[PDB]
């Protein structure tokens, strides 16, 4: 297994969702970037693994489920089997990760990407070792009911730049947003 990464889009008030939806109107290019970043494998014949909670899986339209070209794993404690369309179910982040390290997916997975929700982000962010946070900062306030945890700048450094990530302000539906990359190693 390669790289452990987190990807999230957050509003200025740190909101990541509302009533199981996105707090903002859909942003086609922000989704394009989420798709490209998670699907792309930096090693041939390998696939990226996408880890998400139960609410995140149920938040993507059915037609877009499962995310194509990636291994989808749902993190749940109540589910007995993966939702329909899903490929793996783990009870925890640590179990999801051990599965990687099985001859099963062993030879199969390149990078591991955590795509939501808060509880999932909150624990990855505390998982020790190397980690990168891919943050899309949606530059306005939006009514939200679920937030991204606080980024500890004493541990995560904002990268001045990063290969294949635009550095300037983006704008869609007259909504301004920018791409950020933070790295930790502890
Ligand atoms: N803007 C962005 O970038 C993103 C926005 N969102 C949005 O956020 C909301 C979905 O969010 P969120 O509420 O935080 O919920 P989750 O997606 O993270 O789902 C919650 C459930 O997932 C399982 N689970 C979650 N964490 C763990 C764990 N660490 N170990 C085991 N099982 C776990 C549990 O199921 P159980 O009860 O079943 O055991 C828990 O109740 C919607 O609003 C969604 O659209 C989601 C992702 C990214
Ligand atoms: C409303 O339509 C859609 C909603 C979603 N959801 C809400 C999940 C979603 C959306 N954007 C993200 N951005 C980033 N930057 N990181 C994430 N983890 C994202 C997730 C996790 C995902 C979609 O395709 C993946 C989608 O296609 C239309």
Tab-separated table of C-alpha atoms and ligand atoms in Angstrom:
chain	number	residue	atom	x	y	z
A	1	UNK	CA	0.000	0.000	0.000
A	2	UNK	CA	1.201	3.468	-0.859
A	3	UNK	CA	0.036	6.742	0.509
A	4	UNK	CA	-2.665	7.388	3.132
A	5	UNK	CA	-4.663	10.540	2.129
A	6	UNK	CA	-7.811	12.402	3.096
A	7	UNK	CA	-9.821	14.439	0.601
A	8	UNK	CA	-12.599	16.907	1.606
A	9	UNK	CA	-14.421	20.057	0.374
A	10	UNK	CA	-15.178	22.509	3.326
A	11	UNK	CA	-16.964	25.915	3.615
A	12	UNK	CA	-15.513	28.810	5.482
A	13	UNK	CA	-17.490	27.777	8.573
A	14	UNK	CA	-15.887	24.329	8.167
A	15	UNK	CA	-19.169	22.672	7.134
A	16	UNK	CA	-18.919	19.404	5.224
A	17	UNK	CA	-22.638	18.511	4.895
A	18	UNK	CA	-26.241	19.340	5.420
A	19	UNK	CA	-29.069	16.742	5.799
A	20	UNK	CA	-26.891	14.234	4.171
A	21	UNK	CA	-26.201	16.657	1.310
A	22	UNK	CA	-23.490	19.142	0.215
A	23	UNK	CA	-24.050	22.546	1.829
A	24	UNK	CA	-23.480	24.245	-1.584
A	25	UNK	CA	-25.057	23.886	-5.042
A	26	UNK	CA	-23.140	21.221	-7.008
A	27	UNK	CA	-19.752	22.263	-8.371
A	28	UNK	CA	-18.920	20.181	-11.441
A	29	UNK	CA	-15.184	21.019	-11.483
A	30	UNK	CA	-14.719	20.415	-7.774
A	31	UNK	CA	-16.219	16.894	-8.345
A	32	UNK	CA	-13.978	16.495	-11.410
A	33	UNK	CA	-10.922	17.129	-9.252
A	34	UNK	CA	-12.266	14.704	-6.503
A	35	UNK	CA	-12.734	12.055	-9.209
A	36	UNK	CA	-9.266	12.583	-10.792
A	37	UNK	CA	-7.392	12.700	-7.478
A	38	UNK	CA	-8.978	9.454	-6.115
A	39	UNK	CA	-9.008	7.449	-9.301
A	40	UNK	CA	-5.545	8.057	-10.600
A	41	UNK	CA	-2.966	5.413	-9.681
A	42	UNK	CA	0.707	6.308	-9.682
A	43	UNK	CA	1.572	2.570	-10.382
A	44	UNK	CA	0.227	0.326	-13.214
A	45	UNK	CA	-2.112	-2.614	-12.526
A	46	UNK	CA	-2.945	-1.102	-9.139
A	47	UNK	CA	-6.115	0.596	-8.061
A	48	UNK	CA	-6.785	3.181	-5.348
A	49	UNK	CA	-8.911	2.121	-2.358
A	50	UNK	CA	-11.610	4.632	-1.227
A	51	UNK	CA	-12.684	4.400	2.419
A	52	UNK	CA	-15.940	6.136	3.610
A	53	UNK	CA	-18.497	5.993	6.488
A	54	UNK	CA	-22.063	4.808	6.013
A	55	UNK	CA	-23.572	8.309	5.730
A	56	UNK	CA	-20.990	9.256	3.020
A	57	UNK	CA	-21.741	6.191	0.928
A	58	UNK	CA	-25.500	6.938	1.161
A	59	UNK	CA	-24.836	10.590	0.256
A	60	UNK	CA	-23.633	9.868	-3.348
A	61	UNK	CA	-26.369	9.459	-5.979
A	62	UNK	CA	-27.030	5.779	-6.697
A	63	UNK	CA	-26.042	6.222	-10.337
A	64	UNK	CA	-22.578	7.312	-9.150
A	65	UNK	CA	-22.323	4.331	-6.767
A	66	UNK	CA	-19.854	2.643	-6.498
A	67	UNK	CA	-17.163	5.200	-7.514
A	68	UNK	CA	-15.845	3.586	-10.706
A	69	UNK	CA	-12.222	2.520	-11.067
A	70	UNK	CA	-11.599	2.432	-7.300
A	71	UNK	CA	-12.022	-0.190	-4.599
A	72	UNK	CA	-14.926	1.019	-2.391
A	73	UNK	CA	-14.877	0.153	1.317
A	74	UNK	CA	-17.596	1.227	3.777
A	75	UNK	CA	-16.835	1.691	7.449
A	76	UNK	CA	-19.748	0.699	9.665
A	77	UNK	CA	-20.395	-0.953	13.001
A	78	UNK	CA	-24.074	-1.840	12.500
A	79	UNK	CA	-23.943	-3.220	8.925
A	80	UNK	CA	-23.491	-7.045	8.565
A	81	UNK	CA	-22.579	-6.820	4.902
A	82	UNK	CA	-21.445	-4.115	2.502
A	83	UNK	CA	-24.321	-1.993	1.069
A	84	UNK	CA	-25.423	-3.030	-2.354
A	85	UNK	CA	-22.785	-1.805	-4.886
A	86	UNK	CA	-20.010	-1.679	-2.258
A	87	UNK	CA	-17.037	-4.035	-2.184
A	88	UNK	CA	-15.777	-4.254	1.411
A	89	UNK	CA	-17.072	-3.465	4.814
A	90	UNK	CA	-14.783	-2.905	7.797
A	91	UNK	CA	-15.707	-2.296	11.382
A	92	UNK	CA	-12.871	0.249	11.830
A	93	UNK	CA	-10.095	2.286	10.152
A	94	UNK	CA	-7.496	-0.100	11.582
A	95	UNK	CA	-9.321	-3.204	10.233
A	96	UNK	CA	-9.855	-1.520	6.859
A	97	UNK	CA	-6.102	-0.949	6.788
A	98	UNK	CA	-5.187	-4.501	7.854
A	99	UNK	CA	-7.292	-5.859	4.905
A	100	UNK	CA	-4.985	-3.883	2.590
A	101	UNK	CA	-2.084	-5.870	4.020
A	102	UNK	CA	-3.769	-9.179	3.240
A	103	UNK	CA	-2.679	-11.103	0.145
A	104	UNK	CA	-6.242	-10.261	-0.836
A	105	UNK	CA	-5.857	-6.569	-1.761
A	106	UNK	CA	-2.161	-6.822	-1.062
A	107	UNK	CA	-1.066	-6.734	-4.690
A	108	UNK	CA	-4.161	-4.737	-5.709
A	109	UNK	CA	-3.933	-1.325	-3.978
A	110	UNK	CA	-1.870	1.744	-4.680
A	111	UNK	CA	-3.041	4.756	-2.583
A	112	UNK	CA	-5.709	4.832	0.115
A	113	UNK	CA	-8.050	7.816	0.139
A	114	UNK	CA	-10.476	8.621	3.019
A	115	UNK	CA	-13.522	10.443	1.616
A	116	UNK	CA	-15.713	11.185	4.678
A	117	UNK	CA	-17.362	11.617	7.119
A	118	UNK	CA	-16.144	13.613	10.129
A	119	UNK	CA	-15.661	10.708	12.445
A	120	UNK	CA	-13.706	9.024	9.710
A	121	UNK	CA	-11.619	12.114	9.030
A	122	UNK	CA	-11.182	12.745	12.762
A	123	UNK	CA	-9.555	9.338	13.284
A	124	UNK	CA	-7.359	9.244	10.130
A	125	UNK	CA	-6.000	12.615	11.232
A	126	UNK	CA	-4.913	11.061	14.466
A	127	UNK	CA	-3.683	7.767	12.839
A	128	UNK	CA	0.107	8.046	13.235
A	129	UNK	CA	2.520	7.937	10.382
A	130	UNK	CA	2.441	9.910	7.139
A	131	UNK	CA	-0.681	11.632	5.877
A	132	UNK	CA	-1.775	14.201	3.405
A	133	UNK	CA	-4.909	16.327	3.599
A	134	UNK	CA	-6.321	17.480	0.236
A	135	UNK	CA	-8.592	20.337	1.192
A	136	UNK	CA	-10.897	22.251	-1.184
A	137	UNK	CA	-11.700	25.534	0.729
A	138	UNK	CA	-15.125	26.795	-0.511
A	139	UNK	CA	-14.714	30.444	0.293
A	140	UNK	CA	-18.111	31.310	1.877
A	141	UNK	CA	-20.381	30.306	4.689
A	142	UNK	CA	-23.027	27.678	4.133
A	143	UNK	CA	-25.585	26.261	6.583
A	144	UNK	CA	-24.178	22.928	7.684
A	145	UNK	CA	-24.857	20.228	10.266
A	146	UNK	CA	-21.564	18.358	10.039
A	147	UNK	CA	-18.078	19.852	10.174
A	148	UNK	CA	-14.480	18.879	9.389
A	149	UNK	CA	-12.287	18.612	12.535
A	150	UNK	CA	-9.808	21.408	13.357
A	151	UNK	CA	-6.492	21.212	11.408
A	152	UNK	CA	-3.610	21.320	13.909
A	153	UNK	CA	-1.066	23.591	12.169
A	154	UNK	CA	1.580	22.592	14.668
A	155	UNK	CA	1.452	19.138	12.972
A	156	UNK	CA	0.250	19.748	9.416
A	157	UNK	CA	2.167	22.071	7.131
A	158	UNK	CA	0.420	23.759	4.159
A	159	UNK	CA	2.528	22.886	1.032
A	160	UNK	CA	3.371	26.045	-1.051
A	161	UNK	CA	2.469	23.958	-4.040
A	162	UNK	CA	1.863	20.504	-5.258
A	163	UNK	CA	2.113	18.837	-8.638
A	164	UNK	CA	-1.219	18.768	-10.488
A	165	UNK	CA	-3.168	21.000	-8.119
A	166	UNK	CA	-4.104	24.511	-9.287
A	167	UNK	CA	-2.851	27.270	-6.869
A	168	UNK	CA	-5.195	30.022	-7.838
A	169	UNK	CA	-8.748	30.923	-6.867
A	170	UNK	CA	-11.350	28.900	-8.719
A	171	UNK	CA	-14.857	30.148	-9.357
A	172	UNK	CA	-18.082	28.337	-10.246
A	173	UNK	CA	-21.732	29.452	-9.816
A	174	UNK	CA	-20.146	32.631	-8.578
A	175	UNK	CA	-18.736	30.582	-5.665
A	176	UNK	CA	-14.986	31.102	-5.114
A	177	UNK	CA	-12.860	28.165	-3.925
A	178	UNK	CA	-9.126	27.086	-3.723
A	179	UNK	CA	-7.140	23.743	-3.495
A	180	UNK	CA	-4.879	23.158	-0.479
A	181	UNK	CA	-2.432	20.302	0.359
A	182	UNK	CA	-1.271	19.708	3.953
A	183	UNK	CA	1.242	17.083	5.007
A	184	UNK	CA	1.936	15.471	8.398
A	185	UNK	CA	4.593	12.936	9.561
A	186	UNK	CA	4.444	11.884	13.257
B	1	LIG	N1	-17.843	18.234	1.495
B	1	LIG	C1	-17.109	16.880	1.502
B	1	LIG	O1	-16.107	16.977	1.121
B	1	LIG	C2	-17.889	15.658	2.058
B	1	LIG	C3	-19.210	15.967	2.509
B	1	LIG	N2	-19.920	14.824	3.112
B	1	LIG	C4	-21.362	15.031	3.595
B	1	LIG	O2	-21.270	14.816	5.112
B	1	LIG	C5	-22.517	14.070	5.536
B	1	LIG	C6	-22.165	12.548	5.691
B	1	LIG	O3	-21.423	12.633	6.956
B	1	LIG	P1	-21.042	12.078	8.361
B	1	LIG	O4	-22.258	12.368	9.126
B	1	LIG	O5	-19.945	12.638	9.119
B	1	LIG	O6	-21.104	10.414	8.433
B	1	LIG	P2	-20.262	9.077	7.984
B	1	LIG	O7	-20.233	9.246	6.590
B	1	LIG	O8	-18.787	9.274	8.308
B	1	LIG	O9	-21.117	8.035	8.485
B	1	LIG	C7	-21.454	7.679	9.915
B	1	LIG	C8	-21.469	6.153	10.196
B	1	LIG	O10	-20.461	5.590	9.540
B	1	LIG	C9	-19.891	4.441	10.309
B	1	LIG	N3	-18.668	4.911	10.771
B	1	LIG	C10	-18.329	6.239	10.682
B	1	LIG	N4	-17.084	6.406	11.222
B	1	LIG	C11	-16.716	5.082	11.584
B	1	LIG	C12	-15.475	4.447	12.222
B	1	LIG	N5	-14.449	5.359	12.488
B	1	LIG	N6	-15.484	3.116	12.467
B	1	LIG	C13	-16.582	2.447	12.110
B	1	LIG	N7	-17.711	2.855	11.557
B	1	LIG	C14	-17.697	4.214	11.334
B	1	LIG	C15	-21.013	4.280	11.456
B	1	LIG	O11	-22.008	3.478	11.094
B	1	LIG	P3	-22.709	2.539	12.270
B	1	LIG	O12	-23.719	3.340	12.928
B	1	LIG	O13	-23.407	2.144	11.091
B	1	LIG	O14	-21.833	1.731	12.868
B	1	LIG	C16	-21.208	5.803	11.690
B	1	LIG	O15	-22.625	6.090	12.203
B	1	LIG	C17	-23.519	14.291	4.277
B	1	LIG	O16	-23.819	15.594	4.795
B	1	LIG	C18	-22.458	14.067	3.187
B	1	LIG	O17	-22.922	14.427	1.921
B	1	LIG	C19	-19.344	13.531	3.239
B	1	LIG	C20	-18.072	13.303	2.799
B	1	LIG	C21	-17.175	14.325	2.146
B	2	LIG	C1	-24.473	15.473	-5.576
B	2	LIG	O1	-23.650	14.670	-6.454
B	2	LIG	C2	-22.570	14.088	-5.818
B	2	LIG	C3	-22.349	14.125	-4.450
B	2	LIG	C4	-21.198	13.452	-3.968
B	2	LIG	N1	-20.970	13.533	-2.606
B	2	LIG	C5	-21.999	14.340	-1.939
B	2	LIG	C6	-19.681	13.194	-2.048
B	2	LIG	C7	-18.396	14.061	-2.136
B	2	LIG	C8	-18.432	15.179	-3.015
B	2	LIG	N2	-17.434	16.063	-3.190
B	2	LIG	C9	-16.237	15.826	-2.482
B	2	LIG	N3	-15.225	16.768	-2.697
B	2	LIG	C10	-14.044	16.567	-2.057
B	2	LIG	N4	-13.201	17.509	-2.378
B	2	LIG	N5	-13.862	15.547	-1.198
B	2	LIG	C11	-14.833	14.680	-0.974
B	2	LIG	N6	-14.457	13.699	-0.110
B	2	LIG	C12	-16.097	14.719	-1.639
B	2	LIG	C13	-17.208	13.806	-1.498
B	2	LIG	C14	-17.067	12.594	-0.601
B	2	LIG	C15	-20.328	12.675	-4.789
B	2	LIG	C16	-20.675	12.704	-6.130
B	2	LIG	O2	-19.899	11.908	-6.940
B	2	LIG	C17	-18.781	11.374	-6.215
B	2	LIG	C18	-21.748	13.379	-6.685
B	2	LIG	O3	-21.997	13.288	-8.085
B	2	LIG	C19	-23.085	14.134	-8.453
